[PDB]
Amino acid sequence: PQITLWKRPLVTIKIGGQLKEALLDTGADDTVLEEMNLPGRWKPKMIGGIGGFIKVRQYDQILIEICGHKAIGTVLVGPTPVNVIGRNLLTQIGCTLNF
Amino acid sequence: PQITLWKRPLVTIKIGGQLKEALLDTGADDTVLEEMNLPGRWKPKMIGGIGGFIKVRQYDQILIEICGHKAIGTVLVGPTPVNVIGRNLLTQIGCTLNF
Ligand SMILES: CCOP(=O)(COc1ccc(C[C@H](NC(=O)O[C@H]2CO[C@H]3OCC[C@H]32)[C@H](O)CN(CC(C)C)S(=O)(=O)c2ccc([C@H](C)O)cc2)cc1)OCC
């Protein structure tokens, strides 16, 4: 689809079999979701945002469907204020900016 | 133009008579720029994201040129680690997400 930006570009995603709402975020290198239960192993990591660094659980090679488009990649889970889909997954679904 | 998201969507902007580099950020409601001493009145504000909140100064009706596209709106100035063009200005240059 073509998504204008008068509202937050929020979309439904499916991860771990569960539906959630997330923000298409071209300013995020990575995908960071609010704390949730996901199956499989994970590794601790640090990520920095506008206000500082937080601790997250890094899940590699995770199946995630974004607005009807499938991706398999890295998902960070931690105390983010907002579920954000970052460029690591936006590239997988073929997302570009256009003006 | 079309901007792929393999790398950060960095572009040259002109603001307050200066050239700077900023991210085209669909995940930002508003525009936040590195410390710069712009003329005129402003209002203090607190903005938050990953890692917490930072203090910024809100300037209204600021002229910005983004890839040759002119816009005018609110710009928040403060100790941000990156310059982000947010949706308040991206809409004015006709920017969309497409996949
Ligand atoms: C020198 C480098 O410093 P640094 O690395 C941090 O750099 C960066 C910091 C922020 C960004 C932009 C930010 N992206 C990320 O947070 O992405 C995370 C995850 O992926 C990683 O890639 C980039 C960072 C990591 C979002 O696009 C926009 N945000 C909102 C989202 C979270 C809902 S917002 O910024 O909070 C914000 C809040 C309010 C407003 C107005 C009020 O509406 C405007 C903008 C990009 C790089 O370390 C610092 C300790």
Side-chain angles (χ1 to χ4, degrees), chain A residues 1-40 42 44-99, chain B residues 1-40 42 44-62 64-99:
Chain A
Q2 176 162 257
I3 301 178
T4 56
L5 298 173
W6 308 98
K7 293 169 55 158
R8 288 175 179 163
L10 293 167
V11 301
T12 301
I13 62 167
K14 184 171 96 164
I15 187 180
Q18 187 185 47
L19 297 185
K20 297 178 159 288
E21 191 166 61
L23 180 75
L24 303 179
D25 188 351
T26 54
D29 298 347
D30 306 313
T31 296
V32 194
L33 306 178
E34 300 165 351
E35 269 168 64
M36 63 171 298
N37 286 310
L38 273 178
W42 56 270
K45 289 289 198 180
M46 305 292 299
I47 63 174
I50 199 172
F53 285 90
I54 66 170
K55 291 168 34 53
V56 298
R57 314 195 317 264
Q58 177 169 320
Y59 292 83
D60 289 334
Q61 212 162 320
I62 291 288
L63 274 59
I64 180 170
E65 186 160 18
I66 303 162
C67 201
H69 295 248
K70 300 198 184 104
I72 302 176
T74 299
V75 172
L76 309 182
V77 176
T80 176
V82 174
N83 298 328
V84 299
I85 307 309
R87 290 187 297 99
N88 72 305
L89 300 186
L90 297 171
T91 55
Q92 292 204 15
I93 66 174
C95 189
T96 60
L97 286 170
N98 299 271
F99 62 91
Chain B
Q2 173 173 107
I3 298 174
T4 61
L5 301 170
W6 295 118
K7 63 179 182 183
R8 291 179 179 237
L10 288 166
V11 299
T12 299
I13 67 177
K14 179 162 72 163
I15 178 179
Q18 287 190 299
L19 297 187
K20 302 190 168 307
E21 296 295 291
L23 291 176
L24 300 180
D25 192 356
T26 63
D29 295 345
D30 285 299
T31 297
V32 190
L33 297 177
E34 66 183 279
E35 173 60 34
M36 57 186 318
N37 195 42
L38 295 176
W42 51 270
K45 191 175 174 77
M46 288 271 277
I47 60 170
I50 289 171
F53 284 78
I54 62 170
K55 301 174 167 76
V56 300
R57 308 190 301 283
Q58 173 178 343
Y59 294 87
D60 299 324
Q61 292 304 95
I62 298 299
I64 307 187
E65 202 177 76
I66 304 154
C67 279
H69 297 253
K70 293 189 182 117
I72 173 152
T74 296
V75 174
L76 308 173
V77 176
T80 179
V82 303
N83 299 331
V84 299
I85 306 305
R87 289 188 299 100
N88 71 314
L89 299 183
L90 295 170
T91 54
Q92 299 187 26
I93 67 174
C95 189
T96 57
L97 289 171
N98 301 79
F99 59 96

XYZ file of all heavy atoms in Angstrom, chain A residues 1-5 7-15 18-26 31-34 64-71 82-86 89-90 93 95, chain B residues 26-27 87 97-99:
387
model
N 0.812 -1.224 0.000
C 0.000 0.000 0.000
C 0.843 1.270 0.000
O 2.046 1.192 0.225
C -0.803 -0.115 1.295
C 0.122 -0.885 2.209
C 0.861 -1.869 1.324
N 0.209 2.405 -0.286
C 0.815 3.726 -0.131
C 0.254 4.364 1.135
O -0.970 4.451 1.301
C 0.529 4.616 -1.336
C 1.065 6.032 -1.176
C 1.185 6.769 -2.493
O 2.274 6.916 -3.035
N 0.067 7.241 -3.006
N 1.139 4.766 2.044
C 0.739 5.213 3.376
C 1.169 6.661 3.529
O 2.367 6.969 3.532
C 1.345 4.336 4.486
C 0.905 2.879 4.311
C 0.950 4.843 5.857
C 1.481 1.925 5.326
N 0.198 7.549 3.661
C 0.475 8.941 3.967
C 0.776 9.090 5.463
O 0.576 8.171 6.260
C -0.709 9.817 3.565
O -1.880 9.334 4.217
C -0.926 9.802 2.039
N 1.235 10.277 5.854
C 1.845 10.464 7.166
C 1.127 11.524 7.991
O 1.711 12.083 8.927
C 3.331 10.806 7.041
C 4.151 9.700 6.364
C 5.586 10.155 6.102
C 4.156 8.447 7.203
N -1.279 10.706 9.902
C -1.445 9.960 11.139
C -0.211 9.080 11.315
O 0.553 8.865 10.370
C -2.716 9.109 11.101
C -3.993 9.942 11.074
C -5.208 9.086 10.761
C -5.334 7.907 11.717
N -6.736 7.388 11.786
N -0.009 8.583 12.523
C 1.079 7.640 12.767
C 0.915 6.420 11.869
O -0.188 5.853 11.801
C 1.089 7.219 14.233
C 1.558 8.336 15.154
C 1.434 7.918 16.614
N 1.907 8.990 17.498
C 1.630 9.071 18.795
N 0.875 8.134 19.363
N 2.115 10.080 19.516
N 1.965 5.999 11.159
C 1.854 4.792 10.329
C 1.818 3.521 11.150
O 2.792 2.763 11.187
C 3.107 4.855 9.456
C 4.119 5.622 10.301
C 3.286 6.659 11.023
N 0.683 3.279 11.797
C 0.486 2.106 12.628
C -0.097 0.984 11.793
O -0.997 1.207 10.976
C -0.457 2.413 13.795
C 0.095 3.392 14.840
C -1.023 3.868 15.769
C 1.203 2.741 15.637
N 0.415 -0.227 12.009
C -0.045 -1.408 11.293
C -0.141 -2.580 12.262
O 0.478 -2.600 13.327
C 0.887 -1.779 10.112
C 0.979 -0.633 9.127
C 2.272 -2.163 10.627
N -0.937 -3.566 11.875
C -1.042 -4.799 12.640
C 0.089 -5.735 12.240
O 0.416 -5.879 11.056
C -2.410 -5.451 12.398
O -3.445 -4.533 12.778
C -2.542 -6.714 13.217
N 0.705 -6.355 13.237
C 1.750 -7.337 12.994
C 1.365 -8.637 13.681
O 0.540 -8.648 14.594
C 3.124 -6.862 13.493
C 3.108 -6.654 15.002
C 3.504 -5.544 12.802
C 4.483 -6.493 15.633
N 1.999 -9.735 13.254
C 1.829 -11.041 13.890
C 3.200 -11.588 14.249
O 4.059 -11.734 13.372
C 1.088 -12.025 12.980
C 0.818 -13.367 13.680
C -0.110 -14.255 12.845
C 0.682 -15.245 12.004
N -0.201 -16.353 11.497
N 3.406 -11.875 15.531
C 4.679 -12.373 16.041
C 4.379 -13.369 17.152
O 3.529 -13.122 18.019
C 5.604 -11.243 16.541
C 6.986 -11.816 16.887
C 4.998 -10.550 17.740
C 7.977 -10.803 17.385
N 0.740 -14.105 17.809
C -0.125 -13.116 18.432
C -0.133 -11.831 17.616
O 0.904 -11.416 17.089
C 0.351 -12.813 19.858
C -0.577 -11.923 20.665
C -0.007 -11.564 22.025
O 1.157 -11.179 22.141
N -0.821 -11.703 23.063
N -1.306 -11.217 17.508
C -1.449 -9.939 16.826
C -1.101 -8.781 17.750
O -1.420 -8.804 18.942
C -2.878 -9.762 16.311
C -3.380 -10.747 15.264
C -4.779 -10.315 14.784
C -2.428 -10.843 14.089
N -0.438 -7.770 17.190
C -0.110 -6.551 17.914
C -0.153 -5.376 16.943
O -0.208 -5.557 15.730
C 1.277 -6.639 18.548
C 1.438 -7.717 19.582
C 2.866 -7.729 20.105
C 2.953 -8.403 21.474
N 2.351 -7.558 22.533
N -0.118 -4.162 17.495
C -0.030 -2.932 16.716
C 1.394 -2.391 16.813
O 2.005 -2.414 17.881
C -1.025 -1.885 17.222
C -1.181 -0.692 16.293
C -2.413 0.150 16.629
O -2.488 0.688 17.755
O -3.316 0.248 15.774
N 1.945 -1.940 15.691
C 3.319 -1.448 15.685
C 3.442 -0.298 14.702
O 2.631 -0.144 13.790
C 4.328 -2.538 15.322
N 4.489 0.499 14.893
C 4.716 1.729 14.140
C 5.834 1.517 13.138
O 6.939 1.111 13.517
C 5.093 2.859 15.092
C 5.371 4.256 14.545
C 4.095 4.908 14.167
C 6.146 5.067 15.579
N 5.549 1.812 11.871
C 6.563 1.775 10.825
C 7.476 2.970 11.039
O 7.048 4.124 10.898
C 5.911 1.808 9.452
C 4.898 0.695 9.177
C 4.341 0.901 7.757
C 5.533 -0.655 9.348
N 8.741 2.698 11.354
C 9.654 3.701 11.902
C 10.962 3.776 11.125
O 11.937 3.100 11.454
C 9.900 3.371 13.380
C 10.664 4.437 14.110
O 11.166 5.382 13.454
O 10.716 4.314 15.348
N 11.001 4.649 10.126
C 12.180 4.703 9.275
C 13.392 5.232 10.027
O 14.524 5.016 9.588
C 11.916 5.545 8.032
O 11.441 6.844 8.394
C 10.863 4.863 7.138
N 14.155 -3.244 15.138
C 12.769 -3.444 15.547
C 12.744 -3.727 17.044
O 13.418 -4.650 17.518
C 12.122 -4.584 14.755
O 12.075 -4.192 13.373
C 10.721 -4.865 15.275
N 11.979 -2.927 17.782
C 11.916 -3.016 19.235
C 10.454 -3.086 19.646
O 9.665 -2.196 19.308
C 12.612 -1.834 19.928
C 12.809 -2.159 21.414
C 13.920 -1.519 19.239
N 10.088 -4.145 20.358
C 8.725 -4.337 20.816
C 8.669 -4.287 22.335
O 9.651 -4.607 23.011
C 8.172 -5.678 20.349
C 8.243 -5.937 18.840
C 7.685 -7.342 18.563
C 7.469 -4.920 18.078
N 7.511 -3.890 22.859
C 7.273 -3.880 24.294
C 7.424 -5.289 24.855
O 7.327 -6.291 24.138
C 5.877 -3.336 24.589
C 5.653 -1.908 24.090
C 4.163 -1.536 24.072
O 3.309 -2.422 24.282
O 3.858 -0.357 23.842
N 7.943 -12.791 11.602
C 7.059 -11.668 11.916
C 6.384 -11.229 10.629
O 7.046 -11.052 9.603
C 7.828 -10.499 12.566
C 6.877 -9.346 12.884
C 8.955 -10.018 11.654
C 7.510 -8.261 13.741
N 5.063 -11.073 10.677
C 4.279 -10.648 9.528
C 3.829 -9.215 9.761
O 3.297 -8.896 10.826
C 3.069 -11.552 9.293
C 2.315 -11.227 8.013
C 1.448 -12.390 7.542
O 1.175 -13.299 8.365
O 1.050 -12.388 6.354
N 4.052 -8.355 8.776
C 3.833 -6.917 8.923
C 2.861 -6.500 7.831
O 3.213 -6.511 6.643
C 5.143 -6.117 8.822
C 6.154 -6.597 9.862
C 4.887 -4.632 8.989
C 7.581 -6.183 9.562
N 1.633 -6.147 8.221
C 0.637 -5.667 7.263
C 0.521 -6.612 6.066
O 0.453 -6.184 4.909
C 0.986 -4.251 6.799
S -0.377 -3.321 6.136
N 0.527 -7.915 6.348
C 0.343 -8.911 5.313
C 1.595 -9.325 4.583
O 1.499 -10.083 3.609
N 2.762 -8.850 5.011
C 4.033 -9.166 4.369
C 4.928 -9.856 5.383
O 5.087 -9.375 6.501
C 4.716 -7.910 3.818
C 3.957 -7.249 2.707
N 4.416 -7.214 1.407
C 2.765 -6.608 2.700
C 3.547 -6.570 0.652
N 2.534 -6.198 1.410
N 5.507 -10.977 4.994
C 6.294 -11.786 5.904
C 7.735 -11.295 5.983
O 8.326 -10.859 4.989
C 6.268 -13.256 5.468
C 4.862 -13.863 5.434
C 4.924 -15.394 5.445
C 3.537 -16.019 5.324
N 3.290 -16.549 3.950
N 8.298 -11.387 7.179
C 9.701 -11.106 7.418
C 10.222 -12.133 8.403
O 9.460 -12.745 9.158
C 9.907 -9.686 7.963
N 6.957 2.250 22.623
C 6.139 2.012 21.440
C 6.725 0.829 20.685
O 7.948 0.692 20.593
C 6.100 3.270 20.535
C 5.366 2.994 19.238
C 5.478 4.446 21.278
N 5.857 -0.052 20.187
C 6.300 -1.080 19.242
C 6.708 -0.408 17.934
O 5.870 0.215 17.270
C 5.196 -2.090 18.972
C 4.772 -2.854 20.221
O 5.568 -3.109 21.125
N 3.506 -3.236 20.261
N 7.982 -0.524 17.561
C 8.486 0.103 16.345
C 9.044 -0.967 15.423
O 9.830 -1.807 15.857
C 9.563 1.164 16.643
C 8.948 2.271 17.515
C 10.759 0.554 17.298
N 8.647 -0.919 14.160
C 9.245 -1.726 13.102
C 10.356 -0.907 12.457
O 10.087 0.146 11.868
C 8.192 -2.126 12.061
C 6.993 -2.789 12.738
C 8.811 -3.054 11.022
C 7.358 -3.907 13.664
N 11.598 -1.385 12.577
C 12.758 -0.680 12.087
C 13.210 -1.146 10.706
O 12.641 -2.035 10.081
N 13.585 -4.748 9.189
C 12.413 -5.453 8.684
C 11.698 -4.690 7.582
O 11.131 -5.317 6.685
C 11.420 -5.740 9.818
C 11.956 -6.590 10.966
C 10.831 -6.920 11.944
C 12.606 -7.880 10.438
N 11.737 -3.350 7.601
C 11.112 -2.595 6.524
C 11.739 -2.939 5.176
O 11.049 -2.970 4.157
C 11.227 -1.101 6.790
C 10.520 -0.606 8.034
C 10.893 0.865 8.302
C 9.017 -0.751 7.925
N 10.210 -6.172 3.698
C 8.893 -6.122 3.077
C 8.866 -5.145 1.911
O 7.800 -4.863 1.341
C 7.805 -5.758 4.103
C 7.997 -4.336 4.623
C 7.822 -6.732 5.266
C 6.876 -3.847 5.529
N 9.794 -1.862 1.755
C 9.304 -0.531 2.062
C 10.319 0.525 1.629
O 11.523 0.405 1.889
C 9.005 -0.443 3.559
S 8.150 1.062 4.064
N 9.601 8.515 9.800
C 8.167 8.286 9.912
C 7.725 7.934 11.330
O 6.525 7.962 11.623
C 7.747 7.170 8.953
O 8.390 5.944 9.327
C 8.106 7.502 7.539
N 8.648 7.572 12.205
C 8.322 7.251 13.579
C 8.291 8.421 14.541
O 8.028 8.247 15.740
N 6.816 13.730 11.079
C 5.664 13.710 10.187
C 5.090 15.100 9.976
O 4.534 15.385 8.905
C 4.593 12.768 10.733
C 4.989 11.283 10.634
C 3.806 10.370 11.018
N 3.356 10.590 12.387
C 2.297 11.316 12.740
N 1.551 11.924 11.840
N 1.983 11.445 14.014
N 5.164 6.248 2.731
C 5.729 4.909 2.773
C 5.034 4.041 1.735
O 3.825 4.165 1.517
C 5.554 4.271 4.149
C 6.395 4.829 5.290
C 5.915 4.204 6.602
C 7.859 4.517 5.072
N 5.797 3.158 1.101
C 5.263 2.350 0.009
C 5.857 0.955 0.045
O 7.079 0.807 0.061
C 5.564 2.993 -1.358
C 4.989 4.375 -1.490
O 5.542 5.349 -0.973
N 3.880 4.477 -2.208
N 4.999 -0.060 0.034
C 5.450 -1.446 -0.082
C 4.305 -2.296 -0.633
O 4.457 -3.498 -0.833
C 5.955 -2.000 1.260
C 4.935 -1.984 2.364
C 4.180 -3.103 2.640
C 4.762 -0.858 3.147
C 3.246 -3.095 3.654
C 3.821 -0.837 4.162
C 3.063 -1.956 4.416
